[PDB]
Amino acid sequence: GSSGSSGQRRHDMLAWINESLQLNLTKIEQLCSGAAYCQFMDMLFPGSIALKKVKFQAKLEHEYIQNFKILQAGFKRMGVDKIIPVDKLVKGKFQDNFEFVQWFKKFFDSGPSSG
C-alpha cells in the first residue's frame, strides 16, 4: 500500500523485491550482496537455494560473491540458462545491478514452464 507502482524508474524494481521478502532498498546497487534473490528463490522454489548459507549481513565484497555463488547454484540446480556476473554485482557500481535485476525480474515472472 501507499506509494504505488507504475512510474518513477529505479524504485520500480526495488518495489518488486521490497514487495517479496519485505525489504526497503532505496537503490539498485543495494543488491550488491546477493541475498534478496536467494530469499526470493526459496519463496518461489523451496529447496533451490541454501538460505541456510547465504550471508544476509555481508559487509565485505568477497562475501557478496559467495552470496551469489549460492544463488547461482539456484539456477544450475533448477535449469536457468543464466550465468550470473557476480563480479559485476559485487562491483557496487550500479547498472551492472540494474541491467541484471531487470532481467532476473522479467524471467522470475516468466521462467520455466509451470511453477
Side-chain angles (χ1 to χ4, degrees), residues 28-29 88-89 92-102:
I28 286 276
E29 244 195 63
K88 308 175 63 142
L89 305 166
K93 76 128 159 188
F94 199 77
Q95 174 196 358
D96 277 336
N97 262 284
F98 194 121
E99 303 284 298
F100 162 94
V101 59
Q102 51 102 344

Short mmCIF file of all heavy atoms in Angstrom, two decimals, residues 28-29 88-89 92-102:
data_model
loop_
_atom_site.label_atom_id
_atom_site.label_comp_id
_atom_site.label_asym_id
_atom_site.label_seq_id
_atom_site.Cartn_x
_atom_site.Cartn_y
_atom_site.Cartn_z
N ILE A 28 19.46 0.40 -6.50
CA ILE A 28 19.63 -0.92 -7.10
C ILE A 28 20.91 -1.56 -6.57
O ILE A 28 20.93 -2.74 -6.23
CB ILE A 28 19.57 -0.82 -8.62
CG1 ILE A 28 18.14 -0.60 -9.11
CG2 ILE A 28 20.21 -2.05 -9.27
CD1 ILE A 28 17.39 -1.92 -9.22
N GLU A 29 21.96 -0.74 -6.50
CA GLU A 29 23.24 -1.21 -6.02
C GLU A 29 23.07 -1.97 -4.70
O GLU A 29 23.88 -2.83 -4.36
CB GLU A 29 24.22 -0.05 -5.86
CG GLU A 29 25.41 -0.20 -6.81
CD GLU A 29 26.56 0.73 -6.41
OE1 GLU A 29 27.09 0.53 -5.30
OE2 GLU A 29 26.88 1.62 -7.23
N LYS A 88 30.34 -8.47 -11.15
CA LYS A 88 29.79 -7.19 -11.56
C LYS A 88 28.78 -6.71 -10.51
O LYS A 88 28.60 -5.51 -10.32
CB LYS A 88 29.22 -7.27 -12.98
CG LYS A 88 30.24 -7.87 -13.95
CD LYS A 88 29.63 -8.06 -15.33
CE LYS A 88 29.23 -6.71 -15.95
NZ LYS A 88 29.53 -6.70 -17.40
N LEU A 89 28.15 -7.68 -9.86
CA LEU A 89 27.16 -7.38 -8.84
C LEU A 89 27.88 -7.02 -7.54
O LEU A 89 27.29 -6.40 -6.66
CB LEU A 89 26.17 -8.53 -8.70
CG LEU A 89 25.46 -8.96 -9.99
CD1 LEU A 89 24.77 -10.32 -9.81
CD2 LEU A 89 24.48 -7.88 -10.46
N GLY A 92 29.49 -2.97 -7.09
CA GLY A 92 28.78 -1.84 -6.49
C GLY A 92 29.01 -0.56 -7.30
O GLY A 92 29.41 0.46 -6.74
N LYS A 93 28.76 -0.66 -8.59
CA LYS A 93 28.93 0.48 -9.48
C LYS A 93 27.62 0.75 -10.22
O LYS A 93 27.59 1.53 -11.17
CB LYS A 93 30.13 0.25 -10.41
CG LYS A 93 29.77 -0.72 -11.53
CD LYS A 93 30.11 -0.13 -12.90
CE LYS A 93 30.25 -1.23 -13.95
NZ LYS A 93 30.76 -0.67 -15.23
N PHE A 94 26.57 0.10 -9.75
CA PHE A 94 25.26 0.26 -10.35
C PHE A 94 25.26 -0.23 -11.80
O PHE A 94 26.28 -0.70 -12.30
CB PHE A 94 24.94 1.76 -10.33
CG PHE A 94 23.45 2.08 -10.49
CD1 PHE A 94 22.60 1.91 -9.44
CD2 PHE A 94 22.97 2.53 -11.68
CE1 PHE A 94 21.22 2.21 -9.58
CE2 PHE A 94 21.59 2.83 -11.83
CZ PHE A 94 20.75 2.66 -10.78
N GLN A 95 24.10 -0.10 -12.44
CA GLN A 95 23.95 -0.52 -13.82
C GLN A 95 24.08 -2.04 -13.93
O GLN A 95 23.12 -2.72 -14.29
CB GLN A 95 24.97 0.18 -14.72
CG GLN A 95 24.93 -0.37 -16.14
CD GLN A 95 26.18 0.02 -16.93
OE1 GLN A 95 27.05 0.73 -16.45
NE2 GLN A 95 26.22 -0.48 -18.16
N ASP A 96 25.27 -2.53 -13.60
CA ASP A 96 25.53 -3.95 -13.66
C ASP A 96 24.53 -4.69 -12.76
O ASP A 96 24.34 -5.90 -12.90
CB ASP A 96 26.94 -4.27 -13.15
CG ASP A 96 28.05 -4.11 -14.19
OD1 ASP A 96 27.72 -4.19 -15.39
OD2 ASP A 96 29.21 -3.91 -13.75
N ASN A 97 23.92 -3.93 -11.87
CA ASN A 97 22.94 -4.49 -10.95
C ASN A 97 21.54 -4.30 -11.52
O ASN A 97 20.69 -5.19 -11.43
CB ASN A 97 22.99 -3.80 -9.59
CG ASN A 97 23.83 -4.60 -8.59
OD1 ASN A 97 23.40 -5.61 -8.06
ND2 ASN A 97 25.04 -4.10 -8.37
N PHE A 98 21.33 -3.13 -12.11
CA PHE A 98 20.04 -2.80 -12.70
C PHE A 98 19.81 -3.60 -13.98
O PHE A 98 18.72 -4.13 -14.20
CB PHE A 98 20.06 -1.31 -13.04
CG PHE A 98 18.69 -0.72 -13.34
CD1 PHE A 98 18.20 0.30 -12.59
CD2 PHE A 98 17.95 -1.22 -14.37
CE1 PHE A 98 16.92 0.85 -12.88
CE2 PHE A 98 16.67 -0.67 -14.66
CZ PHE A 98 16.18 0.35 -13.91
N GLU A 99 20.85 -3.67 -14.80
CA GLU A 99 20.78 -4.39 -16.05
C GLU A 99 20.71 -5.90 -15.79
O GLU A 99 20.53 -6.68 -16.72
CB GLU A 99 21.96 -4.05 -16.96
CG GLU A 99 22.04 -2.54 -17.22
CD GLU A 99 20.98 -2.11 -18.23
OE1 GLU A 99 21.05 -2.61 -19.38
OE2 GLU A 99 20.11 -1.29 -17.84
N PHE A 100 20.85 -6.25 -14.53
CA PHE A 100 20.80 -7.65 -14.13
C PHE A 100 19.49 -7.98 -13.41
O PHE A 100 18.83 -8.97 -13.72
CB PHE A 100 21.96 -7.89 -13.17
CG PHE A 100 21.83 -9.16 -12.33
CD1 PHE A 100 22.41 -10.31 -12.75
CD2 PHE A 100 21.14 -9.13 -11.16
CE1 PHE A 100 22.29 -11.49 -11.97
CE2 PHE A 100 21.02 -10.31 -10.38
CZ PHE A 100 21.60 -11.47 -10.80
N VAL A 101 19.14 -7.11 -12.47
CA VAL A 101 17.92 -7.29 -11.70
C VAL A 101 16.72 -7.27 -12.65
O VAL A 101 15.82 -8.11 -12.54
CB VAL A 101 17.82 -6.23 -10.60
CG1 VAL A 101 17.84 -4.82 -11.20
CG2 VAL A 101 16.58 -6.45 -9.74
N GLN A 102 16.74 -6.31 -13.57
CA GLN A 102 15.67 -6.17 -14.53
C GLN A 102 15.38 -7.52 -15.21
O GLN A 102 14.23 -7.92 -15.35
CB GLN A 102 16.00 -5.10 -15.57
CG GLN A 102 17.39 -5.33 -16.18
CD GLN A 102 17.28 -5.96 -17.57
OE1 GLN A 102 16.25 -6.48 -17.96
NE2 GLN A 102 18.39 -5.88 -18.29
#
